[PDB]
Amino acid sequence: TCTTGAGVTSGFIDLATYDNLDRALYGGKDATTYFIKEHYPVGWFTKLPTMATRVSGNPAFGQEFSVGVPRSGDYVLNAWLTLKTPEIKLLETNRLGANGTVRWTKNLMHNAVEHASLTFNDICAQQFNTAYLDAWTQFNMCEGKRIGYDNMIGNTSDMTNPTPAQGQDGARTLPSKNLVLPLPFFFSRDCGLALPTVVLPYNEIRINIKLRSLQELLVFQNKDTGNVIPISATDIAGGLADTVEAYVYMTVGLVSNVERCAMAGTVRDMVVEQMQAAPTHIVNPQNTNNVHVDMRFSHAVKALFFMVQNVTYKSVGSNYTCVTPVNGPGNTVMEPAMSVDPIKSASLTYENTTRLANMGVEYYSLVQPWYFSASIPVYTGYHMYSYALNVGSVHPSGSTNYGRLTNASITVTMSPESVVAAAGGGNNNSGYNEPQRFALVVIAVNHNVIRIMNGSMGFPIL
Amino acid sequence: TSGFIDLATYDNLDRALYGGKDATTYFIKEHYPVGWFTKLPTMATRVSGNPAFGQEFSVGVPRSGDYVLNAWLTLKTPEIKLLETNRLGANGTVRWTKNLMHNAVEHASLTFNDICAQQFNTAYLDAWTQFNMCEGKRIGYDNMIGNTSDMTNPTPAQGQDGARTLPSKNLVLPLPFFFSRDCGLALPTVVLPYNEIRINIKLRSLQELLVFQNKDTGNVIPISATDIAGGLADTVEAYVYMTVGLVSNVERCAMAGTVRDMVVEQMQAAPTHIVNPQNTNNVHVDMRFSHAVKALFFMVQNVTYKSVGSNYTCVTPVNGPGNTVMEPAMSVDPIKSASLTYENTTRLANMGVEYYSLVQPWYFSASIPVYTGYHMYSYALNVGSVHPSGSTNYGRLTNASITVTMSPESVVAAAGGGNNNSGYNEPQRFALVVIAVNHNVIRIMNGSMGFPIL
Amino acid sequence: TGAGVTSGFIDLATYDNLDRALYGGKDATTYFIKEHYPVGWFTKLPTMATRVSGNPAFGQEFSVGVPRSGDYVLNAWLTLKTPEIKLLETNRLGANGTVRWTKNLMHNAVEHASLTFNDICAQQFNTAYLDAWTQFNMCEGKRIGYDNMIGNTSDMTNPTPAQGQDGARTLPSKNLVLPLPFFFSRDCGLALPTVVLPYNEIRINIKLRSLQELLVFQNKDTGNVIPISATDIAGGLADTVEAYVYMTVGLVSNVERCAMAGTVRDMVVEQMQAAPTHIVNPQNTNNVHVDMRFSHAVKALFFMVQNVTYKSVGSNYTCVTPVNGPGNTVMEPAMSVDPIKSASLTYENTTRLANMGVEYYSLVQPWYFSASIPVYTGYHMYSYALNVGSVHPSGSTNYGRLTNASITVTMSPESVVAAAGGGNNNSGYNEPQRFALVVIAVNHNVIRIMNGSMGFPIL
Amino acid sequence: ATRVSGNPAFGQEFSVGVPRSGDYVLNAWLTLKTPEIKLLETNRLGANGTVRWTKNLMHNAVEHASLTFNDICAQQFNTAYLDAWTQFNMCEGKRIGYDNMIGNTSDMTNPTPAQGQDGARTLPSKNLVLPLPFFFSRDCGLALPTVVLPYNEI
Amino acid sequence: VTMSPESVVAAAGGGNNNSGYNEPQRFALVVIAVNHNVIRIMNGSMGFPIL
Amino acid sequence: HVRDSHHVIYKRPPVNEYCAETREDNSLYVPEYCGQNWKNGVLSGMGTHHDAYRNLAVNMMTLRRESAVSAGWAHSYL
């Protein structure tokens, strides 16, 4: 069955094939070769996870608590929050009676977390919130880990699946399990950026986390008409346990004695990325369909993430569409018949001299993520404009600083679907049965420099 | 404190691996300055013709920047409304062809002044986007070029129960060019004042852009203007955009007035070969490529109906319940085996099709195709990498051939006789197409560009 | 409408101390100018693997010699042609019986796959290592390709009833391919110097498992598993199989080969170690502590609990065996959670890692120190290194001078109740279940090439 | 010549290596012993049935017979090539002898009825020999230099 | 190759008993070639230079 | 007290034999005395190696692309 021409000798023809182009692309005394890998020594170290101690307050829904960074280590390069969700048990004595279902809000994590801040002594270094978390997880998500992430932060087709009352066919109870959320910080962004706790003494490091009330975490959805009303303690069995079991873990690493001694007593300069959120602007599309928002930023902005968010019902969150979700067949939430991002076009202006014309929404939706990001969002909304070649790269890229820039504004032109969904009149299970309201949020990511010297931290650029 | 126990363990192997005064360390990232620049999208001036389906129009790229580093085309789809007066009558549905974009584009060329620089077409587009598509952006890609279960889903006539109409939404297609492949490769517009870089795009007629299927017998007939409501518009709305970046004055002054050499990737398409499996089970194709080829993509396309495109399966897709489009059970790649011959000696034996389908993409590509067909062979370790790698210079080679042994299912599909909605209700015709991806060198000097080797 | 390209000048004009610190400078590397350097001239091509003893057969070990006379070997895979399955009406289960290929047909029937230099075994892996590595380091985009190459293509794993029933489909006999993960196949930088090894005979030994266990014979109603027999299916159980081994070789330039000829080279390689499996009975106690004994600088640990109730079913790390579901498809029972509830590591009675939750190992560790996250229950991993997939060394602790260490696992009430029987029909745990703890360790080693041979200096 | 791969069986293949520690190789032949065949009265055709060996028993059951040189297919041949070569390059006088070696003895190719019929003849089990036409066997002047080639496994 | 009337009538069946074509007959054309080559012996090894 | 398993015979079949240098064919191709066996037990397995074949292939190719146009013009067409 062997073939006469087949064999290793057939590669002699390819080896003999050689011309001026071949000797220009390949060859040379100093030309590097594959099949040989150079080996160089690296540092000697080790790592292990440690519980982070609690200092201020106690974990409770609707309250704020602080967690201190443990000492006795050398570098900290990780941080995550674990939380034990309570158990939900709907009752037939609720106000809606039979026509009423309860479920967890979409994206349980990124929710009940806001104003998460890192503080050295008494200064804030950076602070994020739900919109920034959603934008980051939609634009810089490595594939393959998406399933694990959607399993660790909720939306596992169990928390978000509506469950009817105990007197109906669906008697399923929402499970009480634990969920983990990594905290995106400048030290967690890259391995090369870590806090030198060994040379940062007497300067307490705190992480402040504020949770949300339990009322704004459960969506009490009407089975028939798709109307949302706030939840109450008497509606469900057991009650609403304000206190919750939430822990903060982080990874610390130890280095060699000679390396620690060498790095002790030296000035350190680090390049970090922070975020600035413009105040929310309430939009009324009934009056006008064009909205101008002025931005006041300070440092070299990397990208602007913007999206208009449905704010009709405070219970339901992370709904940047134009129509609120409604209950569907099979005790599963279904996307309404019509739902598009309310923004139809956007533009930028620097005291006239419009830099970016009235371009289409699909541009920011697809083209910019396709070219200057590591992923493309799978949900409607989340528009982005990046001044840099790569958003996710820690190394600085093309950017402009708004400190030397004059007043800058962003103009948004809405859509006929948005203006018709703003008013009510929708039939049952249409999502827009009640009048709808929207809000616009703008977030910018900028660069900054942190200097560590003489056991103190600060911003030399100021 | 428990980490000290691990840190204490230090053997000869650990001394060889880690440690040392010159050993690099983590947690300390070295920082180096980068260039100062900015970027912004721009329009593209139109120099000849008008955007119309089935016509060819040319666009001059906007110079007067510093580095053009991108290119894409945006188009506005028309509105489709099926009437009750169609030839198929009640038993008739109209839907956009699979992969609406990557179609209606052939001989898409980038030319300098009056000399062609490179070109591509639908086969190259499909092969590249099926072999070098990173995940995460796959949803965005197959959402921005159609394939959204709305354009491609069948729709009955207006009088029937299905009153759905095909939406008119804009679509975008990145144009794969040598400057768009990598950031490090950009056109030196500041260095090229004399050259007049231009881009030519030829569209396709709406007759073959729309699939007119029969609900019962699963047959395809060409569409006509009178069959649909409002007719068809020859003119279409489309623009071309690209990204232009500006550099600092000192850097551009220092870089101006010098000679530079760049490496680029071109496309070479061998002429298609009509295949009749009813007579012979073997098909030979001669390859006449010149430059140092890096990869070869060969595939067999069913060409029974001009409306359906990008179908590399022995059986055409048919209708399906719920107003969907589905492939029948007998839907597999027609190629059974392939081999290559270099001037009377076989470099590769008659090795199986599954090799080219899976093993080669697994080792020498960034992705594996999710559809049937798409057979490839790469002479380089990494196809997606722009840096030169393993390749063979076909210029110094004599005639080379590729032999494909077909499959019994392809043979039986070539004959009709299938029942309703079987796909092969009519005799089937196939065409073998081979595309080659190679390297080249472009020299920039005296405010002009050319090929020193050619 | 807009100012066009002129809008970039007002942006370029913005420049302050921060921009001087980040951008600018007389030595800043600019983009849009990619420096080009030459690379070595070479070529590559596939090749057969020569057969040296007998023919491949199920349940037997066969050896294949590595084809020499090349310059480097950096790729090897095995092609196996599956047989044809045709259930009959004379089976014991009769109407209430279905036959289907086991989950992960590949990674099964390939155990103790070993690479030996001369007559010294250099590497050896098996099903647990293959499954863990594939689940933890599967690059996305190739997932569909892998689940089409190695089986589980919704055709082998779909149950087919007997001929008299409505479902009379036959399992297609399509060839499958399995790459062999070896030290030379890990990266192109590490390639076997075939031309430099004239005094060695490199062999690869593959042990194919018996065909009887490769087929799952499932009761339609009660969800019970019984071994298959030659009388169940038509034709019979063919012990002999038609399989080959393919390899990829490369050729380099004469100047390079002569320059690198006659010199001593040190290489860093990766291989696995497997601790013996331990049968676990959660009825008596829910806490199990197992000693760990490994030799070299370990880098990664994968610990799992495998349901070993039936030999036919493989790669079942859940606590409940899968059962036949509606639509002639395998359906995962609702009550199926990984038996591991908590785990910890102990160093000579000094707890290095506390009694953390199972979700930690399941999700947090892969999220931070891996390129992928498992999509199935089980697959618990702890890595001493920042990046598991990186061939370059990272954080690792050697067990050579480390004293006795232990791993403690605490099971779950679901596992406790699944160990006992009492399950109803189509519940998976109708019969009592049995569990086996398995641990795999991945470490580093050094191989020296000198005088036309190979050896381990560190050992 | 010692065998190195597989075992001799119908439907499978085996590889036999050329013996080493020699100086030249100039011949090659393969010997095989035929089994015993005896028709049974309970066959499918009953009484209306006969069994016989196919014409030219040898040159059959030897297909894709190949010679390889340590990495490459040196050459190969099969039934059609053997038949054509022996019909077009037969030295008369040896024709009867070669036919006898390959079969065609009117004892294996003559059909035999079942044991219940008048013809109770059973096909005998006599070993047969087939030369292997190779380039080193075509002429005496062309031989394989085993001593000169120590880097190949023929 | 041009066929023959005997071949085209033997392809169809209908032959009586012991005629040898009771069932329909099918045929396959086989073509083989005999050629030349050159082998080289050097450096304790052999191969085909022209290939 | 120490052991390695590389090899013990030095340079009789020199490792660098595939390059271009002086040859050693006078020893391993002929037995030293009558009764001595043949020296091919592990060396066999590396076929068509040595740079001579590669150089011969390069020399044969050299200019085939430019020389194939004429070829038989001086032999066939009158």
D139 class by beta-carbon count within 10 Å (0-12 exposed, 13-18 middle, 19+ buried)? exposed
Distance from CA of B20 to the nearest CA of A (A): 7
> Three-state SS across A259-320?
HHHHHCCCCEEEEEEEEEECCCEEECCCCCCEEEEEECCCCEEEEEEEEEEECCCCCCCCCC
Distance CA D104, CA A34 (A): 62
Structure tokens at A441: 């949020």
Amino acid sitting at position C295: S
User: Are A369 and B140 spatial neighbours (Cβ–Cβ below 8 Å)?
Assistant: yes
Are C258 and F54 an interchain contact pair (Cβ–Cβ within 8 Å)?
no
Nearest to A81 by CA among A47, A124, A101, A52: A52
Which of D73, D147, D151 has the highest number of chain E CBs within 10 A, making it the mutation to test binding with E? D151
The strand ranges marked E within B187-334 are 187-188, 197-202, 210-213, 237-247, 260-269, 273-275, 282-287, 292-302, 318-320, 324-326
Nearest to B323 by CA among B11, B18, B23, B93: B93
Are F15 and C452 an interchain contact pair (Cβ–Cβ within 8 Å)?
yes
Helix (H, G, I), strand (E, B) or coil at A107: coil
Nearest to C398 by CA among C303, C302, C300, C295: C295
Distance CA C131, CA C106 (A): 10
Is C24 in CB contact (< 8 Å) with chain B? yes
Distance CA A263, CA A197 (A): 12
DSSP state, residue B54 = T
Torsion of CA B298, B299, B303, B306, to 10 degrees: -80
Q: Which of C69, C72, C253 minimises the CB distance to A8?
A: C69
A7: nearest CA partner in chain D: D72
Query: Phi and psi for B134 in degrees, rounded to 5?
Result: -70, 145
Chain D residues in contact with F47 (beta carbon < 8 A): 69-72, 151-153
User: Are C300 and C383 spatial neighbours (Cβ–Cβ below 8 Å)?
Assistant: yes
Q: Angle at CA D60, nearest 5°, toward D125 and B407?
A: 140
> What is the DSSP track for C196-242?
T--S---EEEEEPPPHHHHEEEE-TTT--B----TTTBSS----B--
Put simply, the chain A residues between 371 and 410 with a CB less than 8 A from any chain C CB are 389, 396, 400-405
Structure tokens at E47: 């191969």
Is C451 in CB contact (< 8 Å) with chain F? yes
User: Are B299 and B375 spatial neighbours (Cβ–Cβ below 8 Å)?
Assistant: yes
Distance CA B104, CA B98 (A): 12
Q: Where is F55: in which H helix or E strand?
A: helix F51-61
Amino acid sitting at position C180: L
Chain E residues in contact with A11 (beta carbon < 8 A): none
**Facing residues of A439 across strands?**
A282, A309
Chain C residues in contact with F48 (beta carbon < 8 A): 69
| CA dist list (Å): D5 to A7, C62, C66, D150 | 20, 11, 15, 20
Distance CA B392, CA F23 (A): 33
F55: nearest CA partner in chain C: C254
Q: Which of A8, A9, A16 minimises the CB distance to F61?
A: A16
Pairing of strands A195-196, A75-76: antiparallel
- Where helices occur in E1-51 by DSSP H, the ranges are 5-11
Q: Which of D5, D7, D70 minimises the CB distance to C52?
A: D5
C366: nearest CA partner in chain A: A145
User: Are A361 and A383 spatial neighbours (Cβ–Cβ below 8 Å)?
Assistant: yes
> What is the DSSP track for A157-180?
SSSSS-B--TTSS----B---EEE
Distance CA B402, CA B419 (A): 35
Distance CA C404, CA C294 (A): 10
The alpha carbon dihedral of A148, A152, A153, A156 has a sign of positive
Q: Which of F29, F46, F48 minimises the CB distance to D147?
A: F29
User: Are B68 and B179 spatial neighbours (Cβ–Cβ below 8 Å)?
Assistant: yes
C241: nearest CA partner in chain D: D12
Structure tokens at A397: 């890229």
Residue B109: Cβ within 10 Å count: 17
Distance from CA of F70 to the nearest CA of C (A): 31
> How large is the C-alpha radius of gyration of chain E?
23
Nearest to C321 by CA among C209, C228, C222: C222
Experimental method of this PDB entry: cryo-EM
Amino acid sitting at position C348: E
Distance CA A316, CA A219 (A): 6
Distance CA C67, CA A187 (A): 50
HSE of C71 in the Cβ direction (CA atoms, 13 Å)? 26
Chain D residues in contact with E41 (beta carbon < 8 A): 145, 148-149
Distance CA B285, CA A278 (A): 63
- What region, left, alpha or beta, does residue A121 occupy, with left being phi > 0 and alpha being psi -120 to 50 degrees? left
Q: Angle at CA A35, nearest 5°, toward A29 and A41?
A: 90
Distance CA A446, CA B6 (A): 40
Are F4 and C196 an interchain contact pair (Cβ–Cβ within 8 Å)?
no
Which of A19, A36, A180, A359 has the highest number of chain C CBs within 10 A, making it the mutation to test binding with C? A36
Is E29 in CB contact (< 8 Å) with chain A? no
Query: Phi and psi for A299 in degrees, rounded to 5?
Result: -105, -175
User: Are F53 and A9 spatial neighbours (Cβ–Cβ below 8 Å)?
Assistant: yes
Burial A50-81 (b: 16+ CB within 10 A, else e): bebeeeeeebebebbbbbebeeebbbbbbbbb
Chain E residues in contact with A8 (beta carbon < 8 A): none
DSSP state, residue D92 = T
Are C352 and A26 an interchain contact pair (Cβ–Cβ within 8 Å)?
no
Distance CA A251, CA A260 (A): 18
Are D151 and F46 an interchain contact pair (Cβ–Cβ within 8 Å)?
yes
Q: Which of D6, D15, D70 minimises the CB distance to C69?
A: D70
Are C24 and B37 an interchain contact pair (Cβ–Cβ within 8 Å)?
no
Are A151 and C363 an interchain contact pair (Cβ–Cβ within 8 Å)?
yes
Are B388 and A25 an interchain contact pair (Cβ–Cβ within 8 Å)?
yes
Residue D127: Cβ within 10 Å count: 9
Which residues 6+ apart lie within 8 Å of C387 measured at CB? C369, C370, C371, C394
- What region, left, alpha or beta, does residue B102 occupy, with left being phi > 0 and alpha being psi -120 to 50 degrees? left
The strand ranges marked E within B77-169 are 93-96, 106-112, 115-120
Chain F residues in contact with D153 (beta carbon < 8 A): 44-45, 47
Q: Which residue has the tokens 């050579």?
A: C400
The alpha carbon dihedral of C185, C188, C190, C195 has a sign of positive
Is B13 in CB contact (< 8 Å) with chain C? yes
Distance CA C239, CA C56 (A): 9
F49: nearest CA partner in chain D: D151
Torsion of CA A109, A110, A111, A114, to 10 degrees: 130
Residue C51: Cβ within 10 Å count: 20
> What is the DSSP track for D25-49?
B---EEEEE---B---TTSSSTTS-
Structure tokens at B120: 């591509």
User: Are C408 and C206 spatial neighbours (Cβ–Cβ below 8 Å)?
Assistant: no
The strand ranges marked E within B390-429 are 392-393, 400-406
Q: Which residue has the tokens 């129960």?
A: B161
Query: Phi and psi for C446 in degrees, rounded to 5?
Result: -125, 130
Distance CA A366, CA A359 (A): 13
DSSP state, residue C62 = E
Nearest to C362 by CA among C169, C19, C132: C132
User: Are C433 and C320 spatial neighbours (Cβ–Cβ below 8 Å)?
Assistant: yes
C206 class by beta-carbon count within 10 Å (0-12 exposed, 13-18 middle, 19+ buried)? buried
Chain C residues in contact with F6 (beta carbon < 8 A): 450-455
Which of D135, D138, D148 has the highest number of chain E CBs within 10 A, making it the mutation to test binding with E? D148
User: Are C324 and C426 spatial neighbours (Cβ–Cβ below 8 Å)?
Assistant: yes
The strand ranges marked E within C341-434 are 342-347, 351-357, 380-383, 397-398, 405-410
Distance from CA of D99 to the nearest CA of F (A): 39
Nearest to B58 by CA among B102, B126, B107, B122: B107
Tell me the resolution in Å: 3.5
Is A129 in CB contact (< 8 Å) with chain C? no
Q: Which residue has the tokens 């002044």?
A: B113
Nearest to C126 by CA among C445, C378, C439: C439
Pairing of strands B93-96, B210-213: antiparallel
Q: Max Cα separation, chain F?
A: 82
Burial B324-362 (b: 16+ CB within 10 A, else e): ebebbeebbbbbbbbbbbbeebbbbbbbbbbbbbbbbbb
Distance CA A396, CA A190 (A): 13
Chain D residues in contact with E45 (beta carbon < 8 A): 149, 151-152
DSSP state, residue C363 = I
Q: Which residue has the tokens 């195709």?
A: B369
Provide the number of CB pairs (under 8 Å) joining chain D to chain E: 20
Are C30 and B35 an interchain contact pair (Cβ–Cβ within 8 Å)?
yes
The strand ranges marked E within B180-259 are 187-188, 197-202, 210-213, 237-247
Q: Which residue has the tokens 């899968």?
A: C322
Distance from CA of E1 to the nearest CA of F (A): 29
Structure tokens at C301: 């640990």
Q: Which of C12, C32, C296 minimises the CB distance to B13?
A: C296
Distance CA E48, CA E35 (A): 15
Q: Which of D20, D69, D151 minimises the CB distance to F38?
A: D20
Distance from CA of D1 to the nearest CA of C (A): 15
Put simply, the chain D residues between 37 and 76 with a CB less than 8 A from any chain A CB are 64, 66, 68, 71-76
Is D2 in CB contact (< 8 Å) with chain C? no
Distance CA A46, CA C384 (A): 7
Put simply, the chain E residues between 25 and 44 with a CB less than 8 A from any chain F CB are 40, 42-44
Nearest to B68 by CA among B241, B206, B214, B239: B241
> Three-state SS across B289-326?
CCCEEEEEEEEEEECCCCCCCCCCCCCCCEEECCCEEE
Nearest to B340 by CA among F56, A449, A443, C46: C46
Which residues 6+ apart lie within 8 Å of A352 measured at CB? none
| CA dist list (Å): A182 to A16, A134, A167, C152 | 56, 13, 39, 33
Put simply, the chain A residues between 134 and 163 with a CB less than 8 A from any chain C CB are 142-145, 147-149, 151-152
Q: Max Cα separation, chain C?
A: 86
Query: Phi and psi for B142 in degrees, rounded to 5?
Result: -80, 5
Structure tokens at C416: 């406790």
A326-329: long-range contacts (C-beta < 8 A, 24 or more apart)?
A: A326/A221, A326/A226, A326/A429, A326/A430, A326/A431, A327/A101, A327/A162, A327/A221, A327/A222, A327/A223, A327/A226, A327/A429
User: Are A153 and A110 spatial neighbours (Cβ–Cβ below 8 Å)?
Assistant: yes
Structure tokens at D1: 């010549």
Are D76 and A7 an interchain contact pair (Cβ–Cβ within 8 Å)?
no
HSE of B22 in the Cβ direction (CA atoms, 13 Å)? 3
Distance CA C97, CA C180 (A): 35
Are D6 and C52 an interchain contact pair (Cβ–Cβ within 8 Å)?
no
Distance CA E10, CA C39 (A): 66
Is A447 in CB contact (< 8 Å) with chain C? yes
Nearest to A179 by CA among A243, A247, A242: A247
A379 class by beta-carbon count within 10 Å (0-12 exposed, 13-18 middle, 19+ buried)? middle
Distance CA A144, CA D152 (A): 48
Distance CA C341, CA A177 (A): 12
Q: Where is B352: in which H helix or E strand?
A: strand B345-352
C326 class by beta-carbon count within 10 Å (0-12 exposed, 13-18 middle, 19+ buried)? exposed
Nearest to C9 by CA among A45, B265, A400: A400
Are F54 and A12 an interchain contact pair (Cβ–Cβ within 8 Å)?
yes
User: Are D82 and D99 spatial neighbours (Cβ–Cβ below 8 Å)?
Assistant: no
User: Are C264 and C411 spatial neighbours (Cβ–Cβ below 8 Å)?
Assistant: no
User: Are A83 and A244 spatial neighbours (Cβ–Cβ below 8 Å)?
Assistant: yes
